[PDB]
Amino acid sequence: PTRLTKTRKHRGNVSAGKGRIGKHRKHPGGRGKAGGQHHHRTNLDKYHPGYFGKVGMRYFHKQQNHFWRPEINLDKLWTLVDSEKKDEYLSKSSASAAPVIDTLAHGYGKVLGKGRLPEVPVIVKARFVSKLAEEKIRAVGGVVELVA
Amino acid sequence: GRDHTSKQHVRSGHRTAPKSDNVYLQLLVKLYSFLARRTDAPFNKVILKSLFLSKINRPPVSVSRISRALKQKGAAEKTIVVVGTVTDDNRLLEFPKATIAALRFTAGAKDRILKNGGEAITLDQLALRAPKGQNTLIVRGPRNSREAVRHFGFGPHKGKAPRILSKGRKFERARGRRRSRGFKV
Amino acid sequence: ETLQKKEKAQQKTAEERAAAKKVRKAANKEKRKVIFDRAAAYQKEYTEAERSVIKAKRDAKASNSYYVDAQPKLVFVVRIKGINKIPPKPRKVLQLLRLTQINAGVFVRLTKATSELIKLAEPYVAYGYPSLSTIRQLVYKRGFGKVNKQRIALSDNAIIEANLGKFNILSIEDLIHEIYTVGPNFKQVSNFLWPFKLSNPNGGFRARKFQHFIQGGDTGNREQFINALVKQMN
Amino acid sequence: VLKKNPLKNKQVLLRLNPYAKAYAAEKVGSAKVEQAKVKPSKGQFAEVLKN
Amino acid sequence: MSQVAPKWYQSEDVPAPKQTRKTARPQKLRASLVPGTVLILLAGRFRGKRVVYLKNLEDNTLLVSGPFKVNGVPLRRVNARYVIATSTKVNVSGVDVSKFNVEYFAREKEIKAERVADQKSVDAALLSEIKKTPLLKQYLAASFSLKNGDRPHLLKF
RNA sequence: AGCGUGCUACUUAUACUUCACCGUGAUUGCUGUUUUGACGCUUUCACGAGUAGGCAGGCGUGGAGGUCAGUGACGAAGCCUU
RNA sequence: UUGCUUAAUUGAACGUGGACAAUUGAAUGAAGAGCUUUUAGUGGGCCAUUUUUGGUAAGCAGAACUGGCGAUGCGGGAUGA
RNA sequence: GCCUAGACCGAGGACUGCGGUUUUUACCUAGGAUGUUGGCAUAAUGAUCUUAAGUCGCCCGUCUUGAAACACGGACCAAGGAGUCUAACGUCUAUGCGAGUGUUUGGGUGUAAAACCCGUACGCGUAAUGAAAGUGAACGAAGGUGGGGGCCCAUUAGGGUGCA
RNA sequence: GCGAGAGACCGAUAGCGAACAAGUACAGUGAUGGAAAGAUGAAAAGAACUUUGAAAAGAGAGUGAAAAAGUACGUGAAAUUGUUGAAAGGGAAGGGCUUGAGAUCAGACUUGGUAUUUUGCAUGCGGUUUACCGGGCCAG
Ligand SMILES: [Mg+2]
Ligand SMILES: [Mg+2]
Ligand SMILES: [Mg+2]
Ligand SMILES: [Mg+2]
Ligand SMILES: [Mg+2]
Ligand SMILES: [Mg+2]
Ligand SMILES: [Mg+2]
Ligand SMILES: [Mg+2]
Ligand SMILES: [Mg+2]
Ligand SMILES: [Mg+2]
Ligand SMILES: [Mg+2]
Ligand SMILES: [Mg+2]
Ligand SMILES: [Mg+2]
Ligand SMILES: [Mg+2]
Ligand SMILES: [Mg+2]
Ligand SMILES: [Mg+2]
Ligand SMILES: [Mg+2]
Ligand SMILES: [Mg+2]
Ligand SMILES: [Mg+2]
Ligand SMILES: [Mg+2]
Ligand SMILES: [Mg+2]
Ligand SMILES: [Mg+2]
Ligand SMILES: [Mg+2]
Ligand SMILES: [Mg+2]
Ligand SMILES: [Mg+2]
Ligand SMILES: [Mg+2]
Ligand SMILES: [Mg+2]
Ligand SMILES: [Mg+2]
Ligand SMILES: [Mg+2]
Ligand SMILES: [Mg+2]
Ligand SMILES: [Mg+2]
Ligand SMILES: [Mg+2]
Ligand SMILES: [Mg+2]
Ligand SMILES: [Mg+2]
Ligand SMILES: [Mg+2]
Ligand SMILES: [Mg+2]
Ligand SMILES: [Mg+2]
Ligand SMILES: [Mg+2]
Ligand SMILES: [Mg+2]
Ligand SMILES: [Mg+2]
Ligand SMILES: [Mg+2]
Ligand SMILES: [Mg+2]
Ligand SMILES: [Mg+2]
Ligand SMILES: [Mg+2]
Ligand SMILES: [Mg+2]
Ligand SMILES: [Mg+2]
Ligand SMILES: [Mg+2]
Ligand SMILES: [Mg+2]
Ligand SMILES: [Mg+2]
Ligand SMILES: [Mg+2]
Ligand SMILES: [Mg+2]
Ligand SMILES: [Mg+2]
Ligand SMILES: [Mg+2]
Ligand SMILES: [Mg+2]
Ligand SMILES: [Mg+2]
Ligand SMILES: [Mg+2]
Ligand SMILES: [Mg+2]
Ligand SMILES: [Mg+2]
Ligand SMILES: [Mg+2]
Ligand SMILES: [Mg+2]
Ligand SMILES: [Mg+2]
Ligand SMILES: [Mg+2]
Ligand SMILES: [Mg+2]
Ligand SMILES: [Mg+2]
Ligand SMILES: [Mg+2]
Ligand SMILES: [Mg+2]
Ligand SMILES: [Mg+2]
Ligand SMILES: [Mg+2]
Ligand SMILES: [Mg+2]
Ligand SMILES: [Mg+2]
Ligand SMILES: [Mg+2]
Ligand SMILES: [Mg+2]
Ligand SMILES: [Mg+2]
Ligand SMILES: [Mg+2]
Ligand SMILES: [Mg+2]
Ligand SMILES: [Mg+2]
Ligand SMILES: [Mg+2]
Ligand SMILES: [Mg+2]
Ligand SMILES: [Mg+2]
Ligand SMILES: [Mg+2]
Ligand SMILES: [Mg+2]
Ligand SMILES: [Mg+2]
Ligand SMILES: [Mg+2]
Ligand SMILES: [Mg+2]
Ligand SMILES: [Mg+2]
Ligand SMILES: [Mg+2]
Ligand SMILES: [Mg+2]
Ligand SMILES: [Mg+2]
Ligand SMILES: [Mg+2]
Ligand SMILES: [Mg+2]
Ligand SMILES: [Mg+2]
Ligand SMILES: [Mg+2]
Ligand SMILES: [Mg+2]
Ligand SMILES: [Mg+2]
Ligand SMILES: [Mg+2]
Ligand SMILES: [Mg+2]
Ligand SMILES: [Mg+2]
Ligand SMILES: [Mg+2]
Ligand SMILES: [Mg+2]
Ligand SMILES: [Mg+2]
């Protein structure tokens, strides 16, 4: 609402809060990102270091679909197990019958190894796993099954 | 005339009331304004101040934070007090039986507390079974984990997060972030 | 029928108040005897010290000697200069003396630290050695205490007891005695005392204030003439 | 509600200082000092008159 | 004025006054005000008249008579602050003023027969004592006024 | 009624002292008498200059939802007027 | 305790355990101390005392510290930042 | 210690306090003015307007170190007349839900641009780092030390637990 | 362009330049440029007639709810102006503060209580004046 703006409170004061010497002018200092190496260096160097220059090699025609690989950690891995059957799986899982967790069908490409698993066998199907993620899965009696 | 040794006509700088106009939060302030004024219990004076806090000053308390506080020695049967929202944590492997008083519970939080044999009560229910906050334990959420705090106090060699819209190799990584491009700060 | 309800409540609470006041007055009678005895003892020791000093002077005169008075241990400092155009160091010194207005008075125990303080504020204050009657009149007419950072009139000995009983000050005369013969709790008693807010002199100042008392002005040490100055201003 | 000067209001003076009553009763404000009529300056203190 | 309605908490009851501790004490009169003193009236109808002071009433007023035959000033009350107390005095020990008080001069043209009788009885003794001092009756029958060069701060009365 | 100097009294600033009132900041207490206002009432103390500028609390205007079963041709709005 | 140091069982740093209690180690003051975020205007200055440079000097130009004017009314200096 | 002249003020509004005099749970000058009398109610009293008198008072706005300036605009009056809207954002605050969140592109529906209902994707968040190939977050009760509000046991003090 | 329905939009210096005989009047050789300008009243009932005047008009009169609505048209501000009344005024005027003077305004004999006198009405209601209680204001 306009009735809440400070333009309404500056009515009656000559300069409208802009100052009498400095005044409000068209574009003192330039337009946009002007002067970034000469008189706005002190701003860009302090608050946006790394702005000027090239780093790394180009990549012509980069298709971001190639690099699609959402991550899931181990402390969130049992959330892909059916909610209505999680407690049963946590009890009756053994080497002979362990729950299967299809991570790709839930939208994940790589299993990472943050956190701790229940000491319960699981079958994890993944496109990729980390070295430590697979070591933690085997310790609880599980296995990693590679898929594509 | 006076030679003023301090600034004149200075407000305290602390909230004396909620900024919120929610009438039901006001009723809670009504109750603990009376309790803090009359019990000499330090718990009630803390609760009254905490009811004034803004949303960022009452960060959410995960159900995992409560579990670690109940795992303190001799704190297993204390009443957990959260002036704010209690959220769920799907990274927990197990939750104990506990009594928790909070402003709000999430669907997962209310389910989990009651699933494990506990209680999920409001802060007015606390004031009857513990009008002095006896055998309680106040839990506060992490304040410095907010995303806005990443950019606070940014400067050369400060290690804070730049205020930037896109992230990548072409975005503020060359000159001033690299000795091969001049200097590094 | 609320008339008879409120009348019954008033008479019941009046009776309870009467009994409690009877007990309170009986207990306070002993305290008032204590402060009476204290005041009488203070008067006796004042007189004894005066007569002792007089006798020592007479004896030294008789015995071909010279009695040198003990240097004064107490001083009363009045800020007689306005609040404009004061250099930072004397300004800070005057602020630390709680002299933040013209005609504000404070009690200072003379040592070296406080003497060098007053020397820094000397061009802006008139100070001197206050007599017992001057202290009494100041405390009686313009005596205020700092209670919860508020300036409260010293209209009852209960205020003084409630604020200085841990320092063995139970009366206005205990406070005056503690000030005059500079006592072990001078610091607490003088800081509890709000800075005295005096009027201008009846009869005016000298023709020009802001020059030393020695040169015909008003600043600096005027000593026993601080009593006349206080008599003018209080 | 209204500060009263104990130097003007006698009741307030007695409220603050009960010994003022004895001071009035004993005439402490005009008490005599008992001593002999002596003059101990007859000797060397006459160095004040001349040198 | 505006459209602001009275609220329920806006009470109309009138509080009682606090208990006042202004216990009245008797009037102090000037040492020059002694019964029998000749007074000068400064204000009122009988301004400038020299009159005899008789009694101090309980109204803080002074009972005064001319006497009426000499002056035309009857028995009445005056205020002590509208009076010059001279140094001339008349012996009024032989004048009975017992019956005179505030209720005598109560407000109810004409004049009471009692008042006329009292006027004559008082004036008889007043005249008897006045005759002893020569020119005192003439002095009382003459009005007072300030002449040119009269300084009341320097005159003795 | 000039110059140097001393003395007595006297003159008056929005300054100082006491007091009234306004506002700001703090403060005492207020639910078995909280009692149809607790965003409220109450006790006490200190303070109050201000361009550029910030903020707060308010006054007024066109139009909109709701409400006053509001005013009004027995006179709305507008306009003039110690 | 150590992977450092010493010829060393020497030291260095960080420690366990024990002793020293309100005169717990000067004064004075303290409308309390500490902390964070965000943003306005400004970025022509000038003056007085004192220190002071160039210049014959300047109501000139330039510095140091403080206080002021600017941004400020009120009493005095008739008048005057 | 005592006597004495004048001026200004009267805030508060049942009681509650501290004292004094105590002849007495009597009275008082002791937590803020009462008593009495006269006059007036066709009015004494108060306010405003106009005007006289006394005293002070330069033309506003602006740029400026400095303006009443011999600096600029303004003869007068009425009406109009200048920090807006939008895309994308920072801080702070309120609200809903919360490891998720966002119905509105679209579909359903409708008393039809409203309201009501639906869901796949997608955006942001839930992982970072490296130029990249790539790799990818528990020694320990998710660590130790000194503080730390609150809480627990105590009994000045003291001990335990100690979120942010 | 054609045909419709709408709006937290503007309300005759606004809204399109144009609500009207508006791309009109008018300018420029020309390309082009380009206004101002809505409102009597329900109804002309748009003032017959008489009279003065050369006439426009005026004065009577008439219509009308209104002529304080006459096409100079509802309402009719200010600048500016006439008349009447009041005041002030020695090379400006105007202002603040204060009081005087004049004018204007305000307010307690209250919803005053007690009975009387004394009268209009539907045993009772309001008024009035005399007594007492007490109150308001200005003062001693
Ligand atoms: Mg403002
Ligand atoms: Mg402003
Ligand atoms: Mg301004
Ligand atoms: Mg302007
Ligand atoms: Mg301005
Ligand atoms: Mg601004
Ligand atoms: Mg400008
Ligand atoms: Mg600028
Ligand atoms: Mg360059
Ligand atoms: Mg993509
Ligand atoms: Mg002030
Ligand atoms: Mg983070
Ligand atoms: Mg973290
Ligand atoms: Mg001091
Ligand atoms: Mg004098
Ligand atoms: Mg003098
Ligand atoms: Mg003198
Ligand atoms: Mg002088
Ligand atoms: Mg002089
Ligand atoms: Mg005095
Ligand atoms: Mg005669
Ligand atoms: Mg002269
Ligand atoms: Mg001379
Ligand atoms: Mg002289
Ligand atoms: Mg003198
Ligand atoms: Mg003032
Ligand atoms: Mg006043
Ligand atoms: Mg408060
Ligand atoms: Mg309210
Ligand atoms: Mg201000
Ligand atoms: Mg509006
Ligand atoms: Mg509009
Ligand atoms: Mg509306
Ligand atoms: Mg006018
Ligand atoms: Mg140790
Ligand atoms: Mg020392
Ligand atoms: Mg900053
Ligand atoms: Mg800034
Ligand atoms: Mg800044
Ligand atoms: Mg800035
Ligand atoms: Mg800027
Ligand atoms: Mg310049
Ligand atoms: Mg500039
Ligand atoms: Mg000098
Ligand atoms: Mg000097
Ligand atoms: Mg210069
Ligand atoms: Mg200066
Ligand atoms: Mg400037
Ligand atoms: Mg100044
Ligand atoms: Mg002046
Ligand atoms: Mg001047
Ligand atoms: Mg001069
Ligand atoms: Mg009063
Ligand atoms: Mg009795
Ligand atoms: Mg009293
Ligand atoms: Mg004038
Ligand atoms: Mg002048
Ligand atoms: Mg300009
Ligand atoms: Mg210039
Ligand atoms: Mg100007
Ligand atoms: Mg010139
Ligand atoms: Mg000029
Ligand atoms: Mg210029
Ligand atoms: Mg020119
Ligand atoms: Mg120009
Ligand atoms: Mg000009
Ligand atoms: Mg011009
Ligand atoms: Mg306008
Ligand atoms: Mg999603
Ligand atoms: Mg929709
Ligand atoms: Mg439609
Ligand atoms: Mg990558
Ligand atoms: Mg690399
Ligand atoms: Mg169409
Ligand atoms: Mg069309
Ligand atoms: Mg349609
Ligand atoms: Mg138009
Ligand atoms: Mg019309
Ligand atoms: Mg028209
Ligand atoms: Mg029509
Ligand atoms: Mg029609
Ligand atoms: Mg005609
Ligand atoms: Mg005609
Ligand atoms: Mg006609
Ligand atoms: Mg008709
Ligand atoms: Mg009409
Ligand atoms: Mg009209
Ligand atoms: Mg009309
Ligand atoms: Mg016209
Ligand atoms: Mg009309
Ligand atoms: Mg018209
Ligand atoms: Mg006009
Ligand atoms: Mg004339
Ligand atoms: Mg002339
Ligand atoms: Mg002329
Ligand atoms: Mg002039
Ligand atoms: Mg003039
Ligand atoms: Mg006037
Ligand atoms: Mg008048
Ligand atoms: Mg009176």
Q: How far is the CA of E156 from the C1' of H98 (A)?
A: 103
Q: How far B42 CA sits from the closest chain C CA (Å)?
A: 21
Cα–Cα distance, B85 to B59 (Å, whole number) = 8
Alpha-carbon distance values, C146 to A10, B4, C159, C183 (Å): 44, 17, 10, 20
Inter-chain residue contact C156 with D7, CB threshold 8 Å: no
Query: Looking at chain C from residue 168 to 227, which residues have their Cβ under 8 Å from any Cβ of chain D?
Result: 171-173
DSSP designation for C140: H
What one-letter code names the amino acid at A82?
A: D
* Cis-peptide into E67, omega within 30 deg: yes
SS3 C157: helix
Inter-chain residue contact A53 with B93, CB threshold 8 Å: no
Q: Does B91 touch chain C (CB under 8 A)?
A: no
Cα–Cα distance, A126 to C226 (Å, whole number) = 96
Which of B 30-89 have CB under 7 A of nucleic chain F?
A: 30, 33-34, 37-38
Q: Are the C-beta atoms of B151 and B161 separated by less than 8 Å?
A: yes
- DSSP string covering D36-50, please? ----TTSSGGGGGT-
Cα–Cα distance, C37 to C177 (Å, whole number) = 13
Q: Does B156 touch chain A (CB under 8 A)?
A: yes
Q: Which residues of B touch A55 (CB under 8 A)?
A: 169-170, 173-174, 178, 181
Cα–Cα distance, A63 to A59 (Å, whole number) = 10
Distance A3 CA to ligand 56 centre (A): 44
Inter-chain residue contact B156 with A46, CB threshold 8 Å: yes
Q: Which residues of B touch C102 (CB under 8 A)?
A: 1
List helix spans (H) across B21-62: 23-36, 42-51
User: Does E7 contact strand F, using a CB cutoff of 7 Å?
Assistant: yes
- DSSP string covering E96-142, please? --TT-STGGG-------HHHHHHHHHHHHHHHHHHTTSTTHHHHHHS
Q: How far is the CA of E22 from the C1' of H13 (A)?
A: 15
A17 belongs to an annotated ligand binding site? yes
Q: How far is the CA of C31 from the C1' of G80 (A)?
A: 68
Q: Does B174 touch chain A (CB under 8 A)?
A: yes
DSSP designation for B38: T
Q: Which residues of C touch B8 (CB under 8 A)?
A: none
State this model's resolution in angstroms. Answer: 3.0
User: Does E81 contact strand I, using a CB cutoff of 7 Å?
Assistant: yes
Please report which helix (H) or strand (E) contains residue C78, including its range.
strand C74-79
SS3 C77: strand
Cβ partners under 8 Å of residue C7, min gap 6? none
Q: Which residues of D touch C35 (CB under 8 A)?
A: 17-19
Please report which helix (H) or strand (E) contains residue B101, including its range.
strand B99-105
Q: Does B7 touch chain C (CB under 8 A)?
A: no
Cα–Cα distance, B137 to B155 (Å, whole number) = 39
Q: Are the C-beta atoms of C140 and C172 separated by less than 8 Å?
A: yes
What one-letter code names the amino acid at B1?
A: G
Q: Are strands A100-102 and A123-126 parallel, antiparallel or unpaired?
A: parallel
Cα–Cα distance, E95 to E75 (Å, whole number) = 13
Strand G bases within 7 angstroms of protein beta carbons: 23, 26-32, 34, 36-38, 40-44, 66-68
